Design an enzyme around this catalytic site. Structure first.
Site, PDB file in Angstrom:
ATOM      1  N   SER A 183       0.515  -1.504   0.111  1.00 37.86           N
ATOM      2  CA  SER A 183      -0.317  -0.515   0.311  1.00 37.86           C
ATOM      3  C   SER A 183       1.102   1.434   0.022  1.00 37.86           C
ATOM      4  CB  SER A 183      -1.066   0.446   1.240  1.00 37.86           C
ATOM      5  OG  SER A 183      -0.390   0.136   2.307  1.00 37.86           O
ATOM      6  N   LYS A 195      -6.886   4.697   9.416  1.00 40.49           N
ATOM      7  CA  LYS A 195      -5.604   4.982   8.671  1.00 40.49           C
ATOM      8  C   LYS A 195      -5.973   6.829   8.747  1.00 40.49           C
ATOM      9  CE  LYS A 195      -4.070   1.877   5.115  1.00 40.49           C
ATOM     10  NZ  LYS A 195      -3.799   1.804   3.748  1.00 40.49           N
TER      11      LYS A 195
END
Lengths: 97, 97
Positions: free
Chosen positions: A52, A95
């Protein structure tokens, strides 16, 4: 940065996409294909999420190429495809906080 | 199907992955400006990528050589393959056999 091997493959993919994007965009510049470069990803991501980080990477390289700073406080994430498609990442709520 | 218009040098390909089957794309691109020297005589070395297994490495070189022959047998005036470097990326997923 204590890279795991899967990240190594991701890194090479993002690198090649940077090299392609430059000659496709501004051919006269040649910073990437003609120079060595060290790149450092700090450790901490769990292995399954490892790839990611890749979308940041490509923007890193391009910033160095033209040499202009990135626009301030623009956090990002993603996963790059070797042809500019992006892919879903996991765990978004942590996140965002 | 990530790409739909398929911009040049990307081709669809079926793959009998370890579970089910999936239509992974294959992609390629230049890695340096091509006309580095109008007189230049250097092999247009390929660079394969995507967690390749060594048997696939042999297969890749074979297919590369067949491409190199097919152009000169077909359209001699073109010389793109023998005179330029090329990155090529095969996404992982196929079982080795």
């Amino acid at each position: 940065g204590q890279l795991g091997e899967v990240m190594k493959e991701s890194a090479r993919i993002a690198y090649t996409f940077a090299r392609a994007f430059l000659m496709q965009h501004a051919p006269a510049n040649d910073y990437l294909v003609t120079s060595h470069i060290h790149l450092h990803v700090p450790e901490g991501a769990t292995p399954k999420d490892g790839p990611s980080a890749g979308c940041t990477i490509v923007t890193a390289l391009l910033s160095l190429a033209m040499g202009r700073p990135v626009r301030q406080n623009l956090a990002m994430t993603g996963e790059v495809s070797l042809t500019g498609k992006i892919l879903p990442v996991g765990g978004i709520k942590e996140k965002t906080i | 199907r990530m790409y739909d218009v398929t911009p040049p040098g990307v081709v669809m390909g079926l793959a009998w992955t370890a579970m089910g089957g999936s239509t992974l794309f294959v992609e390629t691109s230049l890695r340096r400006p091509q006309d580095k020297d109008a007189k230049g005589d250097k092999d247009g070395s390929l660079e394969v990528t995507g967690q390749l297994g060594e048997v696939m490495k042999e297969s890749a070189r074979i297919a590369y050589t067949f491409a190199r022959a097919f152009l000169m047998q077909h359209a001699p005036a073109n010389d793109y393959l023998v005179t330029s470097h090329i990155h090529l990326h095969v996404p992982e997923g196929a079982t080795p056999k």
